[PDB]
Symmetry: none
Amino acid sequence: SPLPTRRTRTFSATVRASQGPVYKGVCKCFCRSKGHGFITPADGGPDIFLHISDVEGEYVPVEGDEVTYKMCSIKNEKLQAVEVVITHLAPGTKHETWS
Amino acid sequence: LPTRRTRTFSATVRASQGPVYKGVCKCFCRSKGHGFITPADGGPDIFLHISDVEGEYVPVEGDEVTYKMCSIPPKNEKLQAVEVVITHLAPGTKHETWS
Amino acid sequence: LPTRRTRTFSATVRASQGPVYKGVCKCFCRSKGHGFITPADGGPDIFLHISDVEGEYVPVEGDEVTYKMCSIKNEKLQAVEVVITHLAPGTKHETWS
Amino acid sequence: LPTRRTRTFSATVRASQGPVYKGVCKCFCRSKGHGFITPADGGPDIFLHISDVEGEYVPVEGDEVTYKMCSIPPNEKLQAVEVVITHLAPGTKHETWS
């Protein structure tokens, strides 16, 4: 897919997203050097695509990290997460900040 | 003075969990990377950093915005706008994109 | 000596709007109406005034706590919106009455 | 009836643990030590005891506020705790305790 960054979300796309509900989920995947990953919804579902630009906080996300996010459709059905916050850090792994 | 990938784990957390406010962009210099939002309901203006702004448009004086609030540790001496969305375009200035 | 009905408008908003820290009640003399909290994560102790304590229990050395912070007119730190999360095992705990 | 000194240990934790809401001071009578907050989302006015107010100002109708929520035990009825005046109501005069 043409990568839907946060500096790229259309005006309305962004406003609609921000007005939706807040979801809980877990970080399944994330490659810092690629700029993306996925998030396994809580309340079960297809994994939501995750772009590095939509991430919030000093920390780089890691598999098993708990997250809250809003959804934003991409121009088909695919789903993206926006306004993404790490709620719980996964114990055991090393957690790293950007920089 | 802090940015998105700089904002401590929990500041990010508690901000995201707070209420949403409406304001108006009062300042913003892209060269410099910050501006100010005067809250609707008047009062003190809130500091605003470019990395905390979502969507494709660059904020401009007069833009309506929803945002969340959050303070600047360890001392919480000043407030800051986070999760900041342009909701209504300042009707008279012509607008650009980060591109 | 800032207290809750004395904290200025901006300080209150600004504290209420910062992170939530964990710590431990280092001491508390009720008759004096204050004490200290020690930050979890190490750091300088935090002034703790009685008016900022929320709940039926008087605080005791060892009580686990959460709080918001607020620099005091340069800066000392005060703890605000202060919650006892676990009671101190050794000691006996009183109520405010 | 419950106050910030009367609030059970347990109640206090959950209250603080829960979400933060926005609202507006519906009323408040300092003489009586209580008023109401109209929730912004929408819904029933939240009871508000004086003890739970932080800051130097006595609350005024139209003051805009954040707060966490609490339930009054036998529950049902709700209450507001950790109550911050985020925005001063512009029209009237604003006072302070004392």
